[PDB]
Amino acid sequence: GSVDFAFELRKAQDTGKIVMGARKSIQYAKMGGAKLIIVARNARPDIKEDIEYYARLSGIPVYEFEGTSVELGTLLGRPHTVSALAVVDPGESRILALGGKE
Numbered sequence: 771g772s773v774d775f776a777f778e779l780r781k782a783q784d785t786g787k788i789v790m791g792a793r794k795s796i797q798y799a800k801m802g803g804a805k806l807i808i809v810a811r812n813a814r815p816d817i818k819e820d821i822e823y824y825a826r827l828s829g830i831p832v833y834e835f836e837g838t839s840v841e842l843g844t845l846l847g848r849p850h851t852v853s854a855l856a857v858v859d860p861g862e863s864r865i866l867a868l869g870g871k872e
Contacts, residue, residue, distance in 0.1 A: 775835075776845055778863045783846065786861030790846055792817045795854035799824040804856040806831055806870050812838035813853035821854050833869030 782788055789798060792813065798804040799821055807825050809818050811834055822832050835842055839851040846852055857865055 773868055775868060778865045778868065779846060781863035782857055782860060782865050785863065786857070786859035788846070789856040789858060790848060790852050791855070792821075792853040795821045795856045796824060798856040798858070799828055799830055802828040802830065804830050804858055805860055806833060806857040806865055806868075807854065808833045808835055808842075808857065808865075808869075809854045810835045810837065810839045810842045810852065812840075817853050831866075831870045 779788070789795070789804075795807055795809070796817075799807060804825075807821060807830055809821055809832060811818075825832050839853050842855070843850050843852040846855070860866055
């Protein structure tokens with residue numbers, strides 16, 4: 771329902787904690803220390819399938835971002851292309867409403 775997403779990411783990184791990176795998102799999904807993991811649809815197939823498969827069995831919901839790694843990186847505040855990010859603490863932001871189970 772016209773989910774902004776931008777305000778939720780900046781509020782989650784300022785109040786809570788956000789772990790940006792393709793390889794770091796797999797390590798957090800392996801042990802099970804993340805609330806919500808967001809993956810970019812324009813990222814690599816092996817990166818998206820490894821994070822989704824490892825997050826499914828551990829018990830962490832995944833949200834497919836409606837855009838690209840360039841827009842996700844520019845939106846978070848980093849000049850590099852972000853393929854995947856692991857949200858450990860939501861805090862004040864309503865990031866769990868975008869794809870945190872229904």
